[PDB]
Structures are given as C-alpha cells and as structure tokens.
Amino acid sequence: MLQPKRTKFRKMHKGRNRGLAQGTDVSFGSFGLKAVGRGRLTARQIEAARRAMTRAVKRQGKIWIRVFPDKPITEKPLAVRMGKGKGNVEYWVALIQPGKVLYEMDGVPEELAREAFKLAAAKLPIKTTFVTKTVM
Template sequence: MEIKLMKSDLRFQKRCIYRLNIRHSNFFLEKGDFGICSADNTLITPYNINCCRMLLKRELKKKGRVHVRCNFNIPKTIKSTGVRMGKGKGDIDHYLGHLSKNDCFLEIKGVSKLLGLKLFRKISYKLPFRIKILDL
C-alpha cells in the first residue's frame, strides 16, 4: 500500500537545517580502540566520511577494522541552475549529518598507538573541521 502525501505533509520531508533541535552524545567508544571526534559543532557530508574510510582502508589493509558512527538524516535541498526565484522549495540533493562538539564519528579497532596517531594526522587533512583523538 502506497502512502500519498498531502501538500501540507510535504513540508516535513524537506526540513530546514537550522530548526532541528538535535541533542545526542557519542563521546564514548563502543567497538573500537581509537575514536575520532569533532572538536566543533558542524555538519558532515557522506563524501567526507567516504574519503576518510577510503584512506583508512588503504592504510590499514587487513590489519584493523573501521566503524562509522554517523547518521545522515538532514536533507539538503537545491534548485537547479538557471531557475528563477519562487516556485517553492527545491528538490532534495543530498543528506547531511550533524556532529556536536566531542561527538565520536569514526572508530578504529586493532591498531597500535603509533599507527593510530599517524592515521589521525592524515584524516585531519581530509576533513573541513577540527578533530580530536579519543583512546582507551
């Protein structure tokens, strides 16, 4: 059975980013030995996480495991180029994830401390915000 949305229900699918009241805490490690936390409140894209994941995959090979702890649940709308103003809100282009200060969004398991610090430095170049390392 397909659910059809009324015009009034459509506005809840395309939420405004800044009206969200997101409160959560991911400061503790769940599965890994090292965690990478954000030092600022920020929005993160799946592209950023994918860059970090590919870098870790290339460096770790089969030595360790990577766990991603980030939800992308904020829709970002965009209008195509050349469209005039008006005519409602644009279509959903991609989704963003919200990171609060001290939120752990990547966990690495099965890695020595020296290699963990090396990976931390490389990941910090790939992300558009400041990060911290969290270890046991």
C-alpha cells in the same frame, strides 16, 4: 556513499545545530576521531575519510563509523528565481556537535591509529582530535 534506504519524508527543514554531542565516549573500538568543532559532514566527506584511513591501516583491525548522513540537503538549480517550492534533494549530511566521536578503530597499534586518523581528518571540514578508550 551512506544514505538512508527509505525516508518518511523527502525533504526537511533547515533546522539549527546548537548544543553539545551525544556519543562522546569510545564505545566499540580502542581509538577514535572525536570532533571538536561543529558543522555538517557530507556523505562524500565521510566516505572519503573512510577510504583514506582504511587504505592507511592496510585492511587491519576493525573500523566503525559512528555517524550517518540522514539529513537531506536541497538545492535550487542554477538561474532559477526564489520561491516556486523547495528545491530538489542533492546530498545528505550528518549534523555534528562538539565532542561527537565520528570514527572508531581497534586491532591496530596506537601509533598507526594516529596516522590513520590524521589522514582521515585531513579530509574532514571540521576540527577533530584523537581520543582513546577510557574506563569510568
């Protein structure tokens, strides 16, 4: 369950999620799961997808998580009225824009890499795709 060890502020504004993504290219491994849609990846969703693919690769090769949940999401408790200050932080998400590489792996065959990424993407709330490292 990824989470910032310390933060300068406990809570932050809702903000927006406009624009396209940085970190488009495959930088560490050989294969990658790149997002196509946009949305929020919860720490729970990220760590679940990691488990899903690390069990599929039989602990072979290396896996990199290119995203990190660092935006705290607050939630008011049930049966409370509006106002009286901002709600308490409940979970952390990572804002995602199209073209963002989320996971990366190397040291496994491509055919198995696609299966691992398929099983991982089955756990993700946003559309994804499979990409391979390119030479530019």
